[PDB]
Ligand SMILES: COc1ccc2c3c(n(CC=C(C)C)c2c1)[C@H](C=C(C)C)N1C(=O)[C@@H]2CCCN2C(=O)[C@]1(O)C3=O
């Protein structure tokens with residue numbers, strides 16, 4: 001049975017995009033150094049130790065307690081903000097993937113923890129955040145890309161992400177059976193990359209006693225699509241401590257979709273947003 | 286049996302009849318939607334912006350185009366008549382809720398002014414879809430995500446370059462290079478409004494009058510909340526935002542919005558909470 005391809009981190013980027021069109025997903029081996037994964041994990045150890053808020057939780061209230069949730073990790077985890085979000089390989093893949101649609105940015109990036117005994121996640125497509133994506137023909141420029149980071153090991157026992165190869169060529173999602181999918185068993189530092197429309201699901205932790213399965217989902221959309229999470233309330237000192245690439249990903253700079261849009265998007269007073277704000281950046285003195 | 290023209294309707298006409306017109310013809314005209322003093326008030330707040338010296342620097346849209354028009358971007362941040370009256374017109378939103386019902390929430394993607402003085406050539410034929418190129422690949426039967434609402438602030442005549450609309454052109458796959466003869470004129474009086482469907486080809490006429498006041502038009506461009514607003518109203522002062530209605534704040538991206546299912550959570554949120562609650566946002570009609 002055909003399995004997800006594993007590629008070296010320095011593999012060719014055009015080859016990777018060809019895998020996204022054929023299979024729909026692939027895995028990068030050893031992209032993140034151990035120290036990067038280790039400091040990201042301790043920053044999420046801090047957020048996970050915070051009790052969930054008393055009021056309304058827009059996503060967690062709509063779903064069963066099959067997972068724990070940390071929204072918008074970019075605002076509380078500097079390692080993601082200043083290192084993972086601007087990874088040079090990740091952006092070489094996005095630039096090749098989104099070349100036909102134009103600029104891209106971060107629509108969402110959150111953590112989910114699956115403790116021992118939790119059921120599987122239903123098979124889904126990430127397109128459901130922007131329902132118009134369902135009507136995009138397969139041959140239209142892609143507008144969505146899902147980048148899945150394992151922060152713990154992914155095994156068959158603890159519920160590694162399940163991907164149905166070639167499922168982006170189905171019209172509908174339907175009700176697939178689990179054995180149609182392939183497991184994305186990975187070590188921390190790997191990355192799972194999933195094309196728009198690819199049907200997938202989290203596995204569900206069957207381990208009797210152990211650390212929960214920990215996964216960070218980074219959702220990159222075309223700048224034509226409204227970000228699921230808005231990073232507009234971030235303190236200016238936090239935003240100005242990011243690089244230019246980082247600020248662009250979090251919606252603080254004016255962006256450019258491809259032609260026929262020859263002006264741009266996310267502007268004000270007919271100027272670039274960052275000029276109007278007079279936004280400093282860490283790599284733009 | 287002459288050349289088909291743009292249909293004219295009264296403001297109090299039924300909204301479902303208006304939507305049928307957008308699907309059949311692609312565009313229609315409402316007569317006497319806005320009182321003349323609202324249009325005049327709007328014209329004088331824009332007279333002020335015109336009297337300010339142009340800013341010495343980069344201008345993203347104006348620098349891409351020849352000097353065939355004068356431009357005032359995001360009129361919602363500088364014109365109270367638009368911000369407090371035009372933008373929240375109940376008939377406009379009766380059309381938007383019907384038109385956008387299948388897509389979910391909608392908001393203001395842009396609203397600007399074009400002044401065309403005597404002697405300026407025509408605007409090229411275009412679709413407003415081009416702000417979001419993914420719209421080009423949307424099937425015609427997919428839930429609409431875009432709508433153009435065109436306000437005349439002066440009289441629209443044949444000689445001063447009234448907006449030219451190509452009826453039925455939303456059933457074309459591409460725009461091509463149309464002849465001016467294919468369009469019909471949207472001749473209107475101030476107070477009227479022209480509603481243009483997604484994918485309908487149109488263009489400004491260019492002022493052929495030898496002497497006279499320039500033609501003024503305000504385009505208000507509404508998108509599904511799934512599409513990133515062309516202009517961002519996030520730099521508006523908090524005192525100005527809190528002086529608006531809830532509907533006004535929702536149109537300018539200051540509140541969490543809801544696309545239709547399969548999105549069951551929402552959009553434009555933060556900390557898994559609504560943006561207006563994170564910001565502790567007051568509103569004029571929400572105590
Ligand atoms: C802890 O993090 C989670 C938990 C559970 C789900 C979860 C889905 N995401 C994706 C979330 C994003 C912000 C990309 C989840 C994330 C996915 C929904 C969307 C919006 C992509 N989703 C669906 O597509 C279908 C359509 C009908 C209702 N659905 C569901 O309830 C669900 O299947 C579903 O369980």
Ligand SMILES: COc1ccc2c3c(n(CC=C(C)C)c2c1)[C@H](C=C(C)C)N1C(=O)[C@@H]2CCCN2C(=O)[C@]1(O)C3=O
Nearest residue numbers: 260261262354356395399409410411412413414415416
């Ligand atoms: C003063 O206000 C203006 C002047 C001139 C144009 C103008 C277009 N808008 C629309 C602008 C909006 C934000 C609704 C204009 C507005 C339109 C561009 C877009 C982005 C919808 N546009 C096109 O679609 C085609 C595609 C290829 C290049 N195009 C053009 O240059 C142009 O035809 C064009 O001239």
Ligand SMILES: O=C(O)CCC(=O)C(=O)O
Nearest residue numbers: 160161200201202203215
């Ligand atoms: O938990 C996983 O491994 C998959 C999660 C996922 O795909 C999602 O929540 O969108």
Ligand SMILES: O=C(O)CCC(=O)C(=O)O
Nearest residue numbers: 399448487488489502504
């Ligand atoms: O000037 C006009 O009446 C046409 C306005 C228009 O189509 C635009 O600039 O998007």
Ligand SMILES: [Co+2]
Nearest residue numbers: 124125126200
């Ligand atoms: Co998913």
Ligand SMILES: [Co+2]
Nearest residue numbers: 411412413487
């Ligand atoms: Co137009």
